[PDB]
Design an enzyme around this catalytic site. Sequence first.
Site, mmCIF file in Angstrom:
data_model
loop_
_atom_site.group_PDB
_atom_site.id
_atom_site.type_symbol
_atom_site.label_atom_id
_atom_site.label_comp_id
_atom_site.label_asym_id
_atom_site.label_seq_id
_atom_site.Cartn_x
_atom_site.Cartn_y
_atom_site.Cartn_z
ATOM 1 N N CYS A 59 1.422 3.106 2.270
ATOM 2 C CA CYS A 59 2.089 3.053 3.976
ATOM 3 C C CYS A 59 3.395 1.704 4.285
ATOM 4 C CB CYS A 59 0.908 2.888 5.267
ATOM 5 S SG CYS A 59 0.248 4.000 5.324
ATOM 6 N N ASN A 94 0.997 -1.286 -0.063
ATOM 7 C CA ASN A 94 -0.068 0.167 0.285
ATOM 8 C C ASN A 94 1.054 1.254 0.155
ATOM 9 O OD1 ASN A 94 1.024 -0.500 2.937
ATOM 10 N ND2 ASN A 94 -0.659 0.412 3.658
ATOM 11 N N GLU A 120 2.803 -1.314 4.220
ATOM 12 C CA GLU A 120 2.759 -2.364 5.560
ATOM 13 C C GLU A 120 1.300 -3.132 4.723
ATOM 14 O OE1 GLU A 120 0.786 -0.067 6.429
ATOM 15 O OE2 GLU A 120 -1.233 -0.573 6.636
#
Lengths: 683, 683, 289, 289
Positions: free
Chosen positions: B377, B375, B379
Amino acid sequence: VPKWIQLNNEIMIQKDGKFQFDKDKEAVHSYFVDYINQNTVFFHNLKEKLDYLVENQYYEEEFLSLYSFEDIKEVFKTAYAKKFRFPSFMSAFKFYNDYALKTNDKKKILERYEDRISIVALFFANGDTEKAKEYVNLMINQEYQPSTPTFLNAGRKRRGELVSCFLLEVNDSLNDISRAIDISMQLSKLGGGVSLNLSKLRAKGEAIKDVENATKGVVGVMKLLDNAFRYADQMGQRQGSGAAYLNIFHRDINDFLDTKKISADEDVRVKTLSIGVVIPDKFVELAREDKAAYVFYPHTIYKEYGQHMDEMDMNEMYDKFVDNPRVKKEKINPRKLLEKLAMLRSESGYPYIMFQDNVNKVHANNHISKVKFSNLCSEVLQASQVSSYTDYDEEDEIGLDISCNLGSLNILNVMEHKSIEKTVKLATDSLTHVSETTDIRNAPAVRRANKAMKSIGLGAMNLHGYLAQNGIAYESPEARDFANTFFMMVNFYSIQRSAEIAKEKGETFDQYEGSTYATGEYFDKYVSTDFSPKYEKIANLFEGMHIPTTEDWKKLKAFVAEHGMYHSYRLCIAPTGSISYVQSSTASVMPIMERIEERTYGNSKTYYPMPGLASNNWFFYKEAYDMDMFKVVDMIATIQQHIDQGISFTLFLKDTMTTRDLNRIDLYAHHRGIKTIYYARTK
Amino acid sequence: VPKWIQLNNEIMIQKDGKFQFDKDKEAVHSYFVDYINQNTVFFHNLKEKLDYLVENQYYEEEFLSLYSFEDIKEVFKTAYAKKFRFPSFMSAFKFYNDYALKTNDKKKILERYEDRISIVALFFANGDTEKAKEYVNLMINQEYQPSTPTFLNAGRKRRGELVSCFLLEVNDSLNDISRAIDISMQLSKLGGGVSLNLSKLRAKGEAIKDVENATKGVVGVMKLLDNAFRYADQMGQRQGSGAAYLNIFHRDINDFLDTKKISADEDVRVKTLSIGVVIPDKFVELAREDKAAYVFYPHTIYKEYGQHMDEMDMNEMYDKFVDNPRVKKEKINPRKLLEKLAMLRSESGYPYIMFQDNVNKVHANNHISKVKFSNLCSEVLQASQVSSYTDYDEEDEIGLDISCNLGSLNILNVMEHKSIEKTVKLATDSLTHVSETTDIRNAPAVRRANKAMKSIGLGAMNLHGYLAQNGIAYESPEARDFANTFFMMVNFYSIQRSAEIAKEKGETFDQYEGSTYATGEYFDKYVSTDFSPKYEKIANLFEGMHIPTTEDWKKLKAFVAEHGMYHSYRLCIAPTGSISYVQSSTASVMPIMERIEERTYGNSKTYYPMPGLASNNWFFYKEAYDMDMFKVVDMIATIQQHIDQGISFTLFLKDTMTTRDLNRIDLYAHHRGIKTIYYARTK
Amino acid sequence: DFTQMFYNQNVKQFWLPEEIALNGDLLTWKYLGKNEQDTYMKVLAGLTLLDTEQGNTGMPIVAEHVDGHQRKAVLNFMAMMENAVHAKSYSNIFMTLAPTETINEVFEWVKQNKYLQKKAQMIVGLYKAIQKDDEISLFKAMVASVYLESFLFYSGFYYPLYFYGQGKLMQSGEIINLILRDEAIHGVYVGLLAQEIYNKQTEEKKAELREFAIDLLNQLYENELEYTEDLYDQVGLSHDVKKFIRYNANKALMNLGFDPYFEEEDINPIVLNGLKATVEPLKDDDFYF
Amino acid sequence: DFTQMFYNQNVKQFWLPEEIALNGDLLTWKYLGKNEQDTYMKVLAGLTLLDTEQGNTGMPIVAEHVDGHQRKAVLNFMAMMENAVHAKSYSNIFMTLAPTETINEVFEWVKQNKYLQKKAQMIVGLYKAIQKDDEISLFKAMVASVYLESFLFYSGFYYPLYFYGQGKLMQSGEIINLILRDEAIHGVYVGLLAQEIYNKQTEEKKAELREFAIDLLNQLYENELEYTEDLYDQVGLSHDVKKFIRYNANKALMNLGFDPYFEEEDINPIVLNGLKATVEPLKDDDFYF
Ligand SMILES: Cc1cn([C@H]2C[C@H](O)[C@@H](COP(=O)(O)OP(=O)(O)OP(=O)(O)O)O2)c(=O)[nH]c1=O
Ligand SMILES: Nc1nc2c(ncn2[C@H]2C[C@H](O)[C@@H](COP(=O)(O)OP(=O)(O)O)O2)c(=O)[nH]1
Ligand SMILES: Nc1nc2c(ncn2[C@H]2C[C@H](O)[C@@H](COP(=O)(O)OP(=O)(O)O)O2)c(=O)[nH]1
Ligand SMILES: [Mg+2]
Ligand SMILES: [Mg+2]
Ligand SMILES: [Mn+2]
Ligand SMILES: [Mn+2]
Ligand SMILES: [Mn+2]
Ligand SMILES: [Mn+2]
């Protein structure tokens, strides 16, 4: 240096004080005999050639299967029976470089001019051998030229769409904006120019569901569309071209215009997106009286009245908008906006100017919708309905998006053959066939409007060539007299053919009953005014040809009332850019830019005298820049009164012309009934 | 100057050689009694407050209607009975500036911390009063913190979605690219961060229907997505954030990376689009052996094999692709590509690095699909299936697009309360409710995957805060021992709660029977290896709290085999950016960057000491830049072995270390089983 | 012993007028009397002329005749500053404060002003008299250049400094201070080159060179007096400016290694107040742990 | 129509050698073979020697003969970049990569080299032949200058760009890229000044100037081919370098308003990776007809 290139270059070598215009016949003869006949694939019989073309994925077997091979052979015989010769080197060069079918490696030539014309005619006739022969005679005589998409792609397996002009309405929603981007990329992928109406989009600093000052305006959508057109670059072949239209009373009009400034920031400037401005009569009235004008936020108007600002008549609604406290607006100077428009057109040729009330005062389908914007070439003026593209799970409300099929009469060849009626009717039949055979699977509104409206565009070209080859100055009143009579006849026979098609098929276009054709209001000026030539010289040009009279127009009005009208729109004069060389014709109804055209192809420079240029008619081929733009406006307004759609009207300006002169030309065009202004070309 | 920020600035005034840490308590006390209590709207009773909030479109009536007002009053009493006090000025400031409800004019304060927590708890419980009280106790004790979207929008009428991470698979078609742009704008409009896989897209210079060198590559789609995210920016308060992921074996990998170079041109560089690179073990092996690697044209592989390149195993098909003549490949130097990756991360922090075989060797749902990208981020690591968006008239084949609800355990407060089991189970229930109440009606694959997979992400924060406040160095083996035991226990109780939810609801996640939970292979290391703490210091930290043994894991494995699992994915450790201040916790499981964090808000400068920072634990709060990244990799890999999804792993680099050091850290992370690397932050 | 440090100083002083926003002077300009605005425009126009010729002619020609790539680099940089930075900055000031017609008129005024034409004739004449490999003609031109840098500019600099010191026209004044900072180092540098040539001469030749320098200074001085009166009488400052130019004449002489020629005087105190990460290749051992 | 625009682009491209740290190049330099190091040194010395001629003679001589204050300022700025920035940058690269004795030997070799000397002296010969008030001789020198800026440098630039595109010698490659970017704009600007002269000529004189330009290009091109083989055969690159020379020759011709001489060719991808009419208001009565 090729022999034909050398021969073509000897035109500029002045012998006995005159250009050697006869060298271009030698140039084209050398070009053929040395390159074309060498690089033309020849087959023992036409059957072998046709089999090779269908089996090697060059042609479509569907349309060729509609004829026995004897009929196709006779059609090809008819094409070659004319023994057509390209008069100039540039005609043959343009055809064999742009439209002639080449091998998959683009090394050899499969199609001659006659083969291309025969294939196009066989595709047009759709199984009729006599109709195919009629189309062959029409095109080999070069009386009618199908548009570049139709002429290039008809009867080809690996072809683009036969339509290249599309007009999309964009609704004020993220769903509709994303769908507009998708449809623009899909249509640009097919090779078509896409015009988008951005007037419904709410301006910058508008509220998005209770979050005020959150909208980026029409310029964010402009950037999205510019990148969409840059990505959908027609498989890297030709740069993706699109147009955006905004009403002059839209709040973002100044931001809309700032995208074309030379000093524009890279986060504002758009590169591949042409811009057109729609100007109602209210704006011209406000600028005329120097009253300070107001541009409105469209979403406030939509919230207050339930209708889009561009869906309403600004002439009656402007005072109500201004006096409404719930409608948001900012003061502008309409004269300063006009001067900014003229400055932008001088600098970059943009925006296109569409006079909204000039279009809609003679629009025959105002019941369906008013004409709100034009195409990328500023000649398509048709009613559109915006689509409501909902969420993915929901059902979309499909509207009408404009897309018309283009064809051009060769005025010189139609006039010399005395075949206005026959050429107009056959061109109408071919355009109707192209309209029916067009199915676009990713633009639902375009497909729905093509099926419902059945609109076609039949243009004309070689007006200046025909006039100069007949000793008539383009700005002369006799030229306008000829244009009046010729385009009245074209309109008469296009209406007659449309009503005949409606009678044959028993169907009219959708919502025909509300049109001015149904009520007879369209025919008022034709049953009241006589459009026969007022000059003996012009009346002699139409000798042997029946010019429709007032009684003929009354009979046509009765016929249309009885049987209806098949096409909502029939006539639009497109620029006709590259097909003019092949037809040895001057582009569209515009006057010639240059007497002799100097162009460079590859590393060799080429010379193209205007068709029919000689010593006797040298000064009748007056260059457009040397002309009075007021008289060109007069000519186009004379033609425009017989064209139901618009005309691609390019302004040809000198370097000495000021902003005030361009504004004066625009205001005189508005005064004379000009619907659209295409380009400001400066010398 | 405000009194509270003046008091907060007295922390740095060193008195007797020590920072005045107690000033922050006075700072927050002054902040409250001088700004918050003054600007807080107070009602006579809670009934008037709730009626005012519901009537004026602040809350949602539907979720508050499932409780009688006596139950809501009891919940609010439970929230206020704790008498929670913010320990620092930054905690209260961040809450009352980012998450506290304010009036429509952003003038006064409607929600306190207790009010927001009670509303979130009543939203989570969905009619259950006792469950609402349990959620109130969980959040007021700050044992569990819902993510910023959920905590900010739970129970609010004019709200965005409760999910902000979305992952989209883009198929190799213009229809799919247009749909990806549309869905990206729709999800960015909702406030979510969107990640897109661009590996299935064919490279630059590939054919589009037998015309060669026609495709613009993934960089054209990257520009389209960048402008789509710039357009959908939500007022620009939080501009649209997107991420693009490309497999390292894609031919466009070098152009994909060149979009982040500082010297990139405006026609190539993307600004709002983060980039990630998916690296299979094959690439690392090729670089290790210094052999000649090959990047591949995805369309050639798809044509030859019928499958996309990223849908195939590169460690088993790379040699077949190289040996295949019909596959088009380009020669690259894998070590040069690794050095370029290191240089790009040093100069910009990009790309994100995903070690694909590290993700998929422990991935529990490889039967559904392999994890192909992360994603925004870096994670979220879940199986995805690409959609087949067809023409307008045709039905679309909807795949699985990833999205999970985020939530963080506070390790310090969970360990203080000895409530790992209860906190994990209640957080799992809350995340399940957030998943069930999410319905994205403009992203069909996101909606389908949310209904089918039922994936949640339960993270943790305050790992470094807990260790530093317990006299444990982050790099110490005792810290990794604690992380091992703690996250094994979290995994145990999350699996237990998922199995209990599946048993209660009688349904598992789609295609559960093919997962490693169903086969029992997931529990191999848990039924074979004991994860009890190896150090007596760590073992006392878990005193009073039962640590599951191998027998407990065998019982849980039998329970899962007999009842199934409700969530395909349960645990993911997100960055937890701004909620860390509110919870007075260190961000995520990463080490702290600064002991005392200096920030400027408007024209005011304020300092934030790390939670619990003092002189007795000053050196246990070692900054992330001063520690060995190998030991941080060891810690993250210790945690990662109990996390089914990934961990947002930021690399903290000094200026002295070269690109070789960054490459060594990346290779050690790959060796140690690190799934993703988020950022290369340099001081 | 000095070129490298002058090179470093010159390049570290690099600036462009666009760095200074000028719209802040609009009001203090509007408020000046017509006499004051007239003198100000004319003063800056006289400066523009001097920098035009120093950039087009003076610095490039001296660069041509001075030996050594580093010395040439310094002189080339100074030349660029004269016409690409200094002369242009005055147009930035003019375009902000004055309408086009007033700008056109002041440039016409420089062409017909007899003192400005005389000083240009004298200075440029000496530049164009330099003969290749003839160090004496070069010395004479360097003296002329020092007199332009360190003396002749100052009848012009007085007025912007006089306003700056009163808190008036401070943005324009900031530009002028940057120009002045440059000319001070230009005058020192060219002075050092002139001294090099002078120090090669016999005592008899030196005596003649001092005569040349002093005669030239006096001739320029007498012309500058008339120029100063012509510009400053209408604003009441001629006597004050005269003291300032004498002060700076002494600085020019000192830049040439000569004793001061004029006696010290008190200058208007207002005018005194007017003053990437390293790339390291991966090893094979980096892939094993 | 163009000088102020080029002024802007030139001054906004200003840079200094000190901005790029060079020492990290030693981490890739040590891994090159002897032939690679030899070619690089020789190419670098070639560029250095040619650029010195441009700084000491080429730009200043053109600035001297061109009329117009603004053009002289732009030309001065370009001369400054050659002498103050480019020359110091080349020296810095050398001092970083080679010891003093090696630098002296390479310059001795390249100074004696037949192909480097042939082109250097051909260009310098045309600069020395400019006559006062003769625009034909000025044009010929401008052609020579454009050929140096836009064509002759590129047989040399090839190698640093080739390394730069591979991730080798990145610091010196960044410097070379900045230098090259300056020479590109120098070539375009001088090209426009040459076209201005060309357009003032009769048709017969134009044809004669075209023949001059093509003849000069041919002489330089044939020597470039020999220069190229002499340097690049030992590292196997000559074929690709020749394509790059022709591509840049075409750019130089286009700068002079001439047609390309050579057919279009693709370039080495590694090197590629390294690389208002008049506003008038509406005064009413224009809305009435
Ligand atoms: C239409 C178009 C596609 N593409 C690229 C993006 C898509 O990933 C890829 C596929 O386009 P498609 O939309 O799938 O085109 P197609 O189906 O007609 O071609 P094919 O038979 O090969 O599938 O082509 C462009 O780069 N530019 C374009 O204008
Ligand atoms: N032979 C032949 N004819 C071609 C070709 N392309 C177009 N034609 C046209 C020329 C004629 O008008 C028509 C029939 O040609 P044919 O098959 O040779 O006929 P026929 O004369 O033997 O009866 O087809 C072609 O490639 N070969
Ligand atoms: N009175 C009041 N109570 C509020 C408000 N916001 C939150 N509360 C909490 C405080 C208590 O825990 C709970 C009940 O408050 P109340 O309605 O005044 O009840 P009570 O104090 O009469 O029992 O609601 C608020 O605005 N007013
Ligand atoms: Mg809406
Ligand atoms: Mg496809
Ligand atoms: Mn100066
Ligand atoms: Mn100076
Ligand atoms: Mn240089
Ligand atoms: Mn140069």
